[PDB]
Every structure is written in C-alpha cells, then in structure tokens.
Amino acid sequence: MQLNQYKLQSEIGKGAYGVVRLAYNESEDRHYAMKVLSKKKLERVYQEIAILKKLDHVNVVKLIEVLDDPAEDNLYLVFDLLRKGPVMEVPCDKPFSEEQARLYLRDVILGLEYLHCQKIVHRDIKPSNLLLGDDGHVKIADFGVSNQFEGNDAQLSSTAGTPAFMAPEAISDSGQSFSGKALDVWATGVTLYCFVYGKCPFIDDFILALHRKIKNEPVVFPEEPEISEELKDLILKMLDKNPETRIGVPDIKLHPWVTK
Numbered sequence: 349m350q351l352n353q354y355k356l357q358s359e360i361g362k363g364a365y366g367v368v369r370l371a372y373n374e375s376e377d378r379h380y381a382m383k384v385l386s387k388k389k390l391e392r393v394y395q396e397i398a399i400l401k402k403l404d405h406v407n408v409v410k411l412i413e414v415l416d417d418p419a420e421d422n423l424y425l426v427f428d429l430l431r432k433g434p435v436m437e438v439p440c441d442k443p444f445s446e447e448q449a450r451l452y453l454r455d456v457i458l459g460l461e462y463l464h465c466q467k468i469v470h471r472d473i474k475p476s477n478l479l480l481g482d483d484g485h486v487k488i489a490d491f492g493v494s495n496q497f498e499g500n501d502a503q504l505s506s507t508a509g510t511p512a513f514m515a516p517e518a519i520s521d522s523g524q525s526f527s528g529k530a531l532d533v534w535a536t537g538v539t540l541y542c543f544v545y546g547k548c549p550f551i552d553d554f555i556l557a558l559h560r561k562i563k564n565e566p567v568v569f570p571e572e573p574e575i576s577e578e579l580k581d582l583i584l585k586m587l588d589k590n591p592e593t594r595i596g597v598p599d600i601k602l603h604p605w606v607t608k
C-alpha cells in the first residue's frame with residue numbers, strides 16, 4: 349500500500365483509534381510511524397490536529413504531516429519513528445534506577461512545561477506514552493485525550509485518560525470543574541513512581557476499588573527497592589490529593605532531587 353510518498357509496511361501497535369504502521373519514504377530513505385485513524389470511530393478534530401502540528405519540542409513527539417481523502421474513512425498522521433518504543437510498560441519485573449528515573453523525569457517536566465506554555469493539557473501522561481528517542485531522551489506522545497485551553501489553565505468536567513493515572517479531584521463527586529495542569533502533575537507523579545517501582549502506587553482490577561484507593565489511600569513506598577528520602581518527598585508532593593497545594597512544574601524544577 350502506497351499513500352502518496354509513503355510505502356506502508358508492517359504494523360507496530362494498535363488501539364481504539366486504529367493502528368500505527370511503519371511508513372517508508374523512499375524519496376528521503378527514512379521510515380516513519382503512521383498512525384491510521386478511523387473517522388467513524390472518532391469538525392473539531394481537524395482544528396485540534398492542526399494545533400498538534402504546530403508543536404515543536406525535543407521532548408514532544410513531532411507530528412510531521414496529515415494525509416486525508418475526505419471521501420474516505422482513514423486519517424493518516426505521520427510522526428517521527430522512535431524504534432526503541434515506549435520507555436516502560438507497567439507492571440514490569442525490574443524498574444529503572446533512581447538516577448535513570450531522574451533523567452526521564454527531567455524530560456517529561458520540560459516537555460510538560462512546554463505543552464502548558466502552549467496552552468495544552470495532555471491528560472494521559474504515563475510510561476507507555478513516553479517514547480524513548482535514539483538520543484536517550486523520552487518524548488511525550490498520544491495527544492488523543494489532550495485539550496487546548498485559554499488563560500492560565502484548563503477548566504475540566506469530563507474525565508479522560510487512563511484510570512490509574514487520574515487525579516483524585518477528577519474522579520471525585522466534586523459538583524465542580526478541576527484544573528487540567530494539576531492533573532498532568534499527578535499523572536507525572538504516578539509515572540515517576542512507576543519509573544522506580546515498575547508498578548502503579550494505586551492498583552486494583554476493580555475500577556471502583558481503584559477509585560477508592562486513589563481518593564482515600566496514602567502513597568505507600570515498598571520496602572524494596574529503597575529510594576532516597578528526597579525522591580519520596582517529591583513523589584508525595586506530586587501525589588498530594590489536594591490540587592490546591594500539589595506541587596507545580598516551576599517548583600518541581602527547583603526540587604532538590606530534580607536539581608541534584
């Protein structure tokens with residue numbers, strides 16, 4: 349299958365959207381990752397995809413181009429190919445070192461800072477959505493649940509993303525909207541915990557039990573592997589159940605663990 353300048357080759361991943369496939373550009377001798385969406389599965393989307401194409405940061409996966417036959421179902425988003433794939437899948441048998449987790453936390457924070465400066469909240473930060481670049485740095489991927497906002501923050505009502513990474517305020521009977529940036533800090537906190545432990549801080553196969561744990565249980569650090577008191581401090585501030593006091597990106601950047 350040829351799609352303009354790309355030869356579509358084998359599948360490398362699948363989802364609710366559709367698939368991701370290798371796309372060979374012969375005129376460049378470069379492979380790409382082509383995300384093939386179904387329009388029936390998805391007006392407003394065309395505008396959101398156009399915002400995503402404007403994004404340019406070393407810790408955000410670059411959307412190269414969009415191909416579309418309006419008379420047909422498929423929508424093709426062409427991205428940079430990162431052949432090392434997701435940095436981690438949870439749960440896993442062996443986590444990263446604390447030192448390695450730090451380099452990846454720095455990447456995510458810089459990427460997130462950049463997205464928030466561009467008035468985007470990601471809403472699905474998690475290890476499997478962090479692609480490992482050939483330069484050793486992670487790039488934030490999967491913007492399917494992201495939202496653009498105006499002003500200083502997103503104000504949100506609906507829940508979206510991955511249950512195990514959703515902040516308490518997003519799943520609580522608030523009768524009130526919640527701030528989108530603090531959702532991304534929380535999710536990054538869950539992610540950070542996954543980097544050093546290989547498992548989420550709140551785990552349950554039963555969604556109501558998962559929600560209860562997220563809302564009601566404190567973070568419990570496994571006795572092994574041991575981590576630094578400084579990392580524990582950062583994780584507890586990022587997983588503060590109160591979004592009003594939960595640490596922000598500016599302070600995360602100044603945290604002693606991050607700067608050490």
Ligand SMILES: CCS(=O)(=O)Nc1ccc2c(c1)[C@H](/C(=N/c1ccc(CN3CCCCC3)cc1)c1ccccc1)C(=O)N2
Binds near residue numbers: 368409434491
């Ligand atoms: C989950 C991210 S997404 O929403 O699919 N977006 C996205 C954007 C840009 C990308 C990608 C995805 C990938 C991407 N790369 C990737 C995925 C899987 C592997 C490992 N396989 C192992 C089996 C043989 C082929 C290679 C290597 C690279 C990917 C696709 C689907 C799910 C997770 C990761 C890539 O290289 N660039």
